[PDB]
Design a protein around this ligand. Structure first.
Ligand SMILES: CCCCCCCCCCCCCCCCCCCC(=O)O[C@H](COC(=O)CCCCCCCCCCCCCC)COP(=O)(O)OCCN
Ligand SMILES: CCCCCCCCCCCCCCCCCCCC(=O)O[C@H](COC(=O)CCCCCCCCCCCCCC)COP(=O)(O)OCCN
Ligand SMILES: CCCCCCCCCCCCCCCCCCCC(=O)O[C@H](COC(=O)CCCCCCCCCCCCCC)COP(=O)(O)OCCN
Ligand SMILES: CCCCCCCCCCCCCCCCCCCC(=O)O[C@H](COC(=O)CCCCCCCCCCCCCC)COP(=O)(O)OCCN
Ligand SMILES: CCCCCCCCCCCC
Lengths: 1019, 144, 96, 48, 48, 48
């Protein structure tokens, strides 16, 4: 195949242009994101039932829905929540590769048949079935400068003038608000309802009546009379449009001739649909827009289109209203991919300089300056064939692949230069002589290195989705590299490589063969020196912490304030005014902006929970290692430790926001016998108090939910309510509508349908003594107090109820102790949970579900590697015991990586495991080309086993130093880089370059040991 | 035919017709399902000692066994050979006659007094300035 | 039923159209609103799209618009059909 | 009685029903036992 | 093109003073002038 | 219609690049394909 290019240099140029034109129009049509989709598909059902606690939500909404989630395909598990806010969140997690559009319609079609089974107030709020892929592309905050617009004035302007066009401008997924729009809002006053003998029921009934829509037909409709001349569609009473019209609604007329209207017993504002969350940006009030990203779109092009559209809105704003950007990771993904493309381009430069050092001709250094950016471009053309994107995972697969590319064009480019030296062959006859040598052990490079990386894409379940992003883009840059070694590489050596520095007097005067010839005399002394390396790598590997992905400076971090039980909205706003004050008088030189959200935290949405979106300065404006999120969050958590009646924990974002953690589990506790909630808490407290007496195995074990809080039970007496003659559906409607709120019907504002709520005014529903201000009509017209038929008391209840696979549960978060593995901690937890009371089960979810179903995949796929690598080397050579000389180079490259990761403080995350296999790739590639030449010198000549080994090692010494020196220096800025995205390239760069120092400084001695020691055993 | 799409196209055109059904049909549950005509298997459940009757077993295998089998992937639908428990109210036309009560008065009393009521909160949003308490209000619950 | 064409325009049609964004392969939309109260919203996709993947993606974000519509629409039921505009043939029936 | 969904493998479904039933057996009341009075899938396995 | 329409305007409080309910009005104006689907019957074995 | 006539010029460009490179990868010479990409305007003028 490379000798077909005897007389066709052009046909090599044609299909090199085709690869550069396939790769050229692929880059311009390929998605650019930060990360791929790692997490398995998950669909969230969100229901809302306003006024209800956790039990009313669970027994009327949550269990009714999830007793109908059946017949849905590819479902792994299901888990729900029930807040005292009144909200349901049922998450249904599916298998990997499930079509998330198909699984979502199957969820909503089983729910659409369950809508007549839910309460009518839940049907009016509407349930939502959305695909949970929670990654804020960028948050558009909107604030007013001086301030006349309040919280709901801004949030209604955003939803009616800004939300609609941001949902346009292609590439935008779903948008999501930080707040709500307007609603017509009736604040009832129970003194006038008591005074005019009205109830809230009489207020609700008159609003559904006097705000409606009428079908009324036509003039001259069909069938007409004969001789009819006129059609006119007739229009009747429409919906109300203004605040003044709702006040004039007749409630009743007293017998003395007076109108009792709505504004006479209530007051009518135009306020928000809910008041649960209040959002601030540096203290002054704000709105917000979370934005998600679509499929097949760039992350660098939509943010350049959203921001280009928000500049086409800033003229039309009210005078005072501007736009801020409290959360935008797009500059982080713009720099950290551009700082990998700089490593690619300055790797081709270092090829060009190393080969002008070792070789002293300009025409040879152009040849890997052509063949390396053709395979790089062709790797982009094959990622579009598989349907991938330009992301962090497939760009560090490039960087790690540029060790193989450099090694495929130094080898042979050099070999053509060598056969031109020791004999005066012309450059076309010499290129064929190199193909007698580097051809057959070059398509064995292509197939040994396939078995290193192809059984890595089969790792499954949201961790093998990361390994598949490396394993496609490296087998791609290894298959074309060989294809670009037989074609368009030899062709560039038969042409433009014209025939016939006090460093060659130092390099070629080397006593290396004088050293190796003394080693082969004494092989037994160094064969046991190899075993000190094998034991030395079997110890540094074990004593090493495990990780997933390194911590990185996103430019934005988080802060979570969590008040105690029963806390209010002002008592939580008090602490966020002391956290915003911290970052603007104590951390002035680091943070541009803080976006405090009172109301929502991790998963709860109480009034005692808040969060802050702290965004730092630019990386260029913020130097120093002291001024990073590894330190700023450490040094604020010290400062928020002495704040009282709160837990304020500043922390850093993870790598993927929707994964879990390494060395950490995720445990469920199911009551599979109908025990109860207080029987499950006693099983929950028994397990935690037993997991606290194993400190050397289990640390940080805790419950994930909430603890029971006092709640105010009101208790109707039944005979006292009938002897007075009041109806319970009048009592429960008065209690529910006034204290909880009641959505009644809709109205139209500025041509936009908006809600109408009925609730008590705020100063009449704050305390348990305000119960005595609410009277109910009997059938005869007497106003009866709540104390006349109903006592009350205080009792504990759960503010948040969890279910798992349709059964009640309590999630338990924990992690293994420092120095032990996860599966050892996970087998202890299910030895403790077998000592629980009878009827309590367990299950593993989260990342612990994936780790349990994929146990023997790491030593079982690498076992298939070692058989195929053995067979592809037994194929290449002529013997069965010839692969050894090559397979034993694997502990020689791993020993340097385990040293370089422990002399810096690294860990075997996913960037260290890809770096091992590319140094196992380079050490095995170099070892094949040594014992290929040494086996050929035995066959075609009469070299006697030490004349063969010493001749082949001195003629492969020169390229084995070129591709090592070009690839140490290539990743050498990756081990020095700081700050902007340098968390990943310090992890992939360090484990490579320390690992391939010990593959070129010691691998060039033990491979000639192993070639002789093996075949004297099998001679 | 792709039966995933062929079963979306059925209950596309069924939810047009579902509000045109009787109310008692809708609150029993209408179900659309991709299934075989015959049973894949039968999973029988017996009691080997005699502490449970025929309808004590059927309640256990519906409350505890039927729903997780129907979420197993591949299971088209599940046929229960029995029924779970219901609160079963056996009326008597003579005592209804003796107290001038009808079955309507039985139904209307049960809907009123077996109710799960959403009663609001002490100190809910929007609060008065200075509010220091927050607690849910518990009205009637379901009878047990 | 029984609504002015401006009333269905802002209570029904725009409510659907700000949600019909983010669907894959979209060439254009074209909706209309009569005085009968009827609205049809054509979602022309780009050629080569599976017409059944596109019919379930326009359907699973039609269903998050039912919380925002007037409630009279949910008893007639808002449809979603894989659509057409020209007749393949007319079959007439007469009496002799 | 378990009907098989359209397209599903009968042996992969039957082996997955037994995985769920094995998780329910530790929490049965005393004396209650699963029997297998009808199953069409052991023909599919034992004939091949 | 833009048709003439016929805005009949039921005033609220004049009807409230005469003693009529608005819902008996709106099902009178709608059923007479537009028509009202009441329920179903069976003609030759079809629900119509 | 404004999508056919707008992408047509790019159809003629990428169709001439392919027939140029297929020719140079068959008849070797770079001058050969240039001998015959000059004959394309002789046959287009009769088509129109
Ligand atoms: C997979 C099938 C690949 C077939 C390859 C093949 O036929 O082998 C040789 C290719 O010769 C050929 O004739 C090339 C076949 C065309 C390349 C595939 C397109 C024929 O063997 P040979 O007689 O040409 O031996 C040449 C000694 N250098
Ligand atoms: C990437 C795939 C490359 C396969 C061909 C690699 C080139 C190679 O080493 O084989 C040359 C010819 O290929 C062949 O001999 C034909 C190999 C057929 C591969 C079919 C795979 C299924 C030998 O080169 P040569 O001309 O010296 O061969 C004289 C044989 N005695
Ligand atoms: C010598 C060539 C060496 C190249 C390296 C490949 C071998 C190393 C990878 C092996 C490997 O781990 O894959 C297996 C299934 C394997 C057999 C099917 C592929 C073989 C196809 C043979 C016929 C191809 C041509 C057909 C037309 C003629 C795991 O994969 P997994 O099964 O665990 O993954 C199922 C998850 N979803
Ligand atoms: C693609 C499969 C490559 C095997 C076909 C190429 C081939 O046989 O040419 C030989 C190259 O040695 C080789 O191709 C050695 C390849 C070793 C891995 C192949 C084992 C699985 C197939 C001739 O080269 P020669 O020196 O053996 O005569
Ligand atoms: C033209 C070269 C194509 C290389 C394709 C790489 C295939 C990698 C498969 C890894 C297992 C999924």
């Amino acid at each position: 195949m490379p000798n077909f290019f005897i007389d066709r240099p052009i046909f090599a140029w044609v299909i090199a242009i085709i690869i550069m034109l396939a790769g050229g129009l692929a880059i311009l049509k390929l998605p650019v994101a930060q990360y791929p989709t790692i997490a398995p598909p998950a669909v969230t059902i969100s229901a809302s039932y306003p006024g209800a606690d956790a039990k009313t939500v669970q027994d009327t909404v949550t269990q009714v829905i999830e007793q109908n989630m059946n017949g849905i395909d590819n479902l792994m598990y299901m888990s729900s929540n029930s807040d005292s806010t009144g909200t349901v969140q049922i998450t249904l997690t599916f298998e990997s590769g499930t079509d998330a559009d198909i699984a979502q319609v199957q969820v909503q079609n089983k729910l659409q048949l369950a809508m007549p089974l839910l309460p009518q107030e839940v049907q009016q709020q509407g349930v939502s079935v959305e695909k949970s892929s929670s990654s804020f592309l960028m948050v558009v905050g909107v604030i007013n400068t001086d301030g006349t617009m309040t919280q709901e004035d801004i949030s209604d302007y955003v939803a009616a003038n800004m939300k609609d066009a941001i949902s346009r401008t292609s590439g935008v997924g779903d948008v999501q608000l930080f707040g709500s729009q307007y609603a017509m809002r009736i604040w009832m006053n129970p003194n006038e309802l008591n005074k005019f003998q009205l109830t809230p029921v009489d207020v609700i009934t008159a609003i559904k009546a006097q705000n409606a829509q009428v079908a009324a037909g036509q003039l001259g409709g069909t069938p007409p009379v004969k001789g009819q001349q006129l059609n006119a569609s007739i229009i009747a009473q429409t919906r109300l449009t203004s605040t003044e019209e709702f006040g004039k609604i007749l409630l009743k007329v007293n017998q003395d001739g007076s109108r009792v209207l709505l504004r006479d017993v209530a007051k009518i504002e135009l306020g928000g649909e809910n008041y649960d969350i209040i959002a601030e940006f540096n203290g002054q009030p704000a709105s917000g827009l979370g934005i998600k990203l679509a499929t097949g779109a760039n992350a660098l092009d939509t943010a350049a289109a959203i921001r280009a559209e928000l500049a086409k809105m800033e003229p039309f704003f009210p005078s005072g209203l501007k736009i801020v950007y409290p959360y935008d990771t797009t500059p982080f993904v713009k720099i950290s991919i551009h700082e990998v493309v700089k490593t690619l381009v300055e790797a081709i430069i270092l090829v060009f300089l190393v080969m002008y050092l070792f070789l002293q001709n300009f025409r040879a250094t152009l040849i890997p300056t052509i063949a390396v950016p053709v395979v790089l471009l062709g790797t982009f053309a094959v990622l579009a064939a598989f349907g991938f994107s330009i992301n962090t995972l497939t760009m560090f697969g490039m960087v790690l692949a540029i060790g193989l590319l450099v090694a495929d064009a130094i080898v042979v480019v050099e070999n053509v230069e060598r056969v031109m030296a020791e004999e005066g062959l012309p450059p076309k006859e010499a290129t064929r002589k190199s193909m007698g040598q580097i051809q057959g052990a070059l398509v064995g490079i292509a197939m040994v290195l396939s078995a290193v990386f192809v059984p890595m894409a089969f790792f499954g379940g949201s961790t093998g989705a990361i390994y598949r992003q490396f394993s496609i883009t490296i087998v791609s840059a290894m298959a074309l590299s060989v294809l670009v070694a037989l074609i368009l590489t030899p062709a560039l050596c038969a042409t433009m490589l014209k025939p016939i520095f006090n460093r060659m007097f130092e390099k070629s005067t080397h006593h290396y063969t004088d050293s190796v010839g003394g080693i082969l005399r004494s092989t037994g002394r160094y064969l046991v020196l190899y075993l000190i390396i094998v034991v030395g790598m079997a110890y540094l590997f074990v004593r090493l912490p495990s990780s997933f992905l390194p911590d990185e400076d996103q430019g934005v971090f988080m802060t979570m304030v969590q008040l105690p039980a029963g806390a209010t909205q002002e008592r939580t706003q008090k602490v966020l005014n002391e956290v915003t004050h911290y970052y603007l008088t104590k951390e002035k030189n680091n943070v541009e902006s803080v976006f405090a959200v009172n109301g929502f935290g991790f998963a709860g949405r109480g009034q005692n929970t808040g969060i802050a979106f702290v965004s730092l300065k630019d990386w260029a404006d913020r130097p120093g290692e002291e001024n990073k999120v590894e330190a700023i969050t450490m040094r604020a958590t010290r400062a928020f430790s002495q704040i009282k009646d709160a837990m304020v924990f500043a922390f850093n974002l993870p790598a993927i926001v929707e994964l879990g953690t390494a060395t950490g589990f995720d445990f469920e506790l199911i009551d599979q016998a109908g025990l109860g909630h207080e029987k499950l808490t006693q099983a929950r407290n028994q397990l935690l108090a037993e997991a606290a007496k194993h400190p050397d195995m289990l640390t940080s074990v805790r419950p994930n939910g909430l603890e029971d809080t006092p709640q105010f039970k009101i208790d109707i007496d039944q005979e006292k309510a009938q002897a007075l003659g009041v109806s319970i559906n009048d009592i429960n409607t008065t209690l529910g509508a006034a204290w909880g709120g009641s959505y009644v019907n809709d109205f139209i504002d500025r041509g936009r349908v908006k809600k109408v709520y009925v609730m008590s005014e705020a100063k009449y529903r704050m305390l348990p003594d305000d119960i005595g201000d609410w009277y109910v009509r009997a059938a005869d017209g007497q106003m009866v107090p709540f104390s006349a038929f109903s006592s009350s008391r205080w009792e504990y209840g759960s503010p948040r109820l969890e279910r798992y696979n349709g059964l009640p549960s309590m999630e338990i978060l924990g992690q293994a102790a420092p120095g032990k593995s996860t599966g050892e901690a996970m087998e202890l937890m299910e030895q403790l949970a077998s000592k629980l009371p009878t009827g309590v089960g367990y299950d593993w979810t989260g990342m612990s579900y994936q780790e349990r179903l994929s146990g023997n995949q790491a030593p079982s796929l690498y076992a298939i590697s070692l058989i195929v690598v053995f067979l592809c080397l037994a194929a290449l050579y002529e013997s069965w015991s010839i692969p050894f000389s090559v397979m034993l180079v694997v502990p020689l490259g791993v020993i340097g990586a385990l040293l370089a990761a422990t002399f810096r403080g690294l860990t075997n995350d996913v960037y260290f495991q890809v770096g091992l296999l590319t140094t196992i790739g380079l050490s095995a590639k170099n070892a094949i080309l040594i014992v290929e030449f040494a086996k050929d010198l035995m066959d075609k000549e009469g070299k006697g086993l030490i004349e063969a080994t010493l001749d082949a090692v001195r003629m492969r010494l020169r390229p084995i130093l070129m591709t090592s020196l070009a690839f140490i220096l290539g990743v050498m800025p990756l081990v020095i880089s700081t700050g902007a995205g340098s968390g990943a390239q310090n992890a992939v760069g360090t484990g490579v370059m320390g690992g391939m120092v010990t593959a070129t400084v010691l691998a060039i001695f033990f491979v000639p040991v192993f070639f002789v020691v093996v075949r004297r055993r099998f001679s």
